[PDB]
């Protein structure tokens, strides 16, 4: 029964391993193994549940084990395994073949098979851990082994993509351990993890690997959010080492998502407004990306309300995610109408929900934005309005209070008006008629730059796949 179960799943794993083995042996092609590894994550997730854990036991028996002798026993010890007589030395798939990792040349140590085996061995370990959700000692045991192994290898062009996806599981397993249970050992454990990120990033800077650095930057910027250091994030993004060429679309959306939250504390939303919009256009619409589209839209509504301008109202109802976007609608309504008591009761009921996404602090600063937006609304209605006429609307305190809040709104060039105290009314200095100025000419220059930007990229993207069809023989 259990004998035929191990031969079926292992043959499918070797069949996929032999495909990428001959691709890296001929010259240098870095895109051939990458296409299979994308589907390998989905195929292995469903395959690990079937036939239990016995598919990876004989895989260690097949290939020679440099480090893996005691790693499979410690993984099966936590589950209190039963002895099926799976002891190595029974199932042999090698049988002295060149593609089978011939044993005699391997045992004599005249050839090195460890490069394409041991590096691939760590990949299958992290896949089974994410399915069973194992924590505590099993997380630290794997992280301690991989770090010296990566420093011993030279990290060739094809070797940089093997561990590129392993860093995502290292950071994920460490964060889920701290949120589940907090202790004093978890704090000092992250200290070593912060040093390991910078040591490997410096090595990958020489190879200029596009996918490797794309995964690191996403994990490094996210670690600064929990650590709470802006100087580490500000100096990191100043180098601009992130390639835009071969990185995946899912990795691009995560990059622009961090720049929106970093620039949000600098009180400059001009650049941050583009990063949050570009992150949505680069994020897939599938179900696996719904978690990112949910968090990205929550930040988009908060950026516009902090700019003094009301965002698009139809964005809530047209989308199907508005169930979680309902609290943000009451925030926009309270700022636009200008009611002081409505804003206090708005954030009170949802105060518990605003703590998870850490957007409650941005909601506290909306208290002043209620008046900032209310002044712009009443200014467009009345070009010349008296001093006591505004207090009768928003129910402000005194007449001197409303007079000094308008002078602050013109600091950034929002209202663009003047206050005449001798006459007793506030007059708007904006006559429009900007068609006679040079201001629209500056915006029109960027539209030509944006049009010709995609023209050069059009020749690069379309012509590249036609290179292989010329050399290949056709009928």
């Amino acid at each position: 029964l259990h004998h035929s179960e191990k031969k079926y799943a292992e043959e499918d794993q070797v069949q996929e391993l032999l495909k990428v083995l001959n691709e890296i042996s001929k010259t240098t092609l870095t895109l051939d193994p990458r296409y299979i590894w994308r589907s390998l994550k989905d195929l292995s997730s469903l395959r690990n549940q079937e036939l239990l854990n016995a598919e990876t036991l004989c895989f260690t028996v097949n290939v020679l084990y440099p480090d893996s002798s005691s790693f499979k026993k410690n993984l099966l010890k936590f589950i209190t395994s039963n002895h099926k007589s799976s002891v190595p030395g029974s199932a042999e798939l090698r049988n002295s073949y060149p593609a089978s990792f011939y044993s005699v040349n391997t045992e004599k140590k005249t050839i090195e098979v460890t490069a394409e085996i041991n590096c691939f061995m760590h990949l299958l370990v992290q896949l089974f851990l994410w399915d069973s959700k194992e924590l505590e000692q099993l997380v630290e045991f794997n992280r301690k082994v991989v770090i010296p192994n990566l420093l011993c290898y030279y990290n060739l062009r094809s070797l940089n993509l093997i561990n590129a996806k392993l860093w995502f599981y290292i950071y994920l397993s460490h964060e889920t351990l701290a949120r589940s249970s907090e202790e004093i050992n978890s704090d000092n454990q992250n200290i070593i993890l912060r040093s390991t990120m910078m040591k490997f990033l410096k090595i990958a800077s020489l190879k200029h690997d596009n996918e490797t650095k794309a995964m690191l930057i996403n994990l490094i910027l996210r670690d600064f959010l929990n650590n709470g250091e802006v100087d580490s994030a500000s100096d990191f993004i100043s180098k601009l080492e992130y390639p835009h060429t071969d990185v995946s679309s899912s990795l691009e959306a995560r990059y622009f998502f961090y720049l929106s939250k970093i620039n949000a504390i600098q009180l400059d939303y001009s650049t941050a407004n583009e990063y949050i919009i570009a992150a949505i256009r680069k994020a897939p619409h599938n179900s696996k990306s719904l978690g990112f589209l949910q968090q990205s839209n929550k930040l988009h509504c908060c950026i516009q309300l902090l700019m003094g301008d009301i965002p698009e109202l139809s964005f809530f109802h047209q989308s199907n995610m508005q169930k979680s976007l309902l609290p943000y609608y009451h925030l926009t309504k309270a700022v636009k109408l200008g009611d002081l008591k409505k804003f206090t009761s708005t954030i009170t009921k949802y105060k518990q929900l605003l703590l998870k996404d850490d957007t409650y602090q941005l909601c506290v600063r909306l208290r002043s934005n209620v008046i900032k937006t209310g002044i712009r609304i009443i200014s467009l209605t009345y070009k010349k309005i008296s001093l006591r006429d505004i207090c009768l609307k928003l129910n402000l305190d005194s007449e001197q209070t409303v007079e000094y809040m308008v002078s602050r709104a013109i600091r950034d060039g929002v209202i663009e008006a003047k206050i005449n105290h001798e006459d007793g009314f506030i007059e708007t200095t904006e006559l429009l008629n900007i068609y006679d100025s040079e201001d629209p000419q500056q915006v029109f220059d960027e539209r030509i730059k944006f049009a010709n930007q995609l023209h050069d990229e059009y020749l690069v993207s379309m012509r590249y796949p036609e290179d292989k069809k010329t050399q290949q023989n056709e009928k």
């Binding site: 698009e312 109202l313 139809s314 809530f316 109802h317 047209q318 609608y329 309504k333």
Partner: peptide, 27 residues
Amino acid sequence: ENWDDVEVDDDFTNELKAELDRYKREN
């Protein structure tokens, strides 16, 4: 649905009939 169906109206209901009060009295 730009600036219309999202906020609806929620006005000009009982205040519309109340306008005829000042029209038929002060006049």
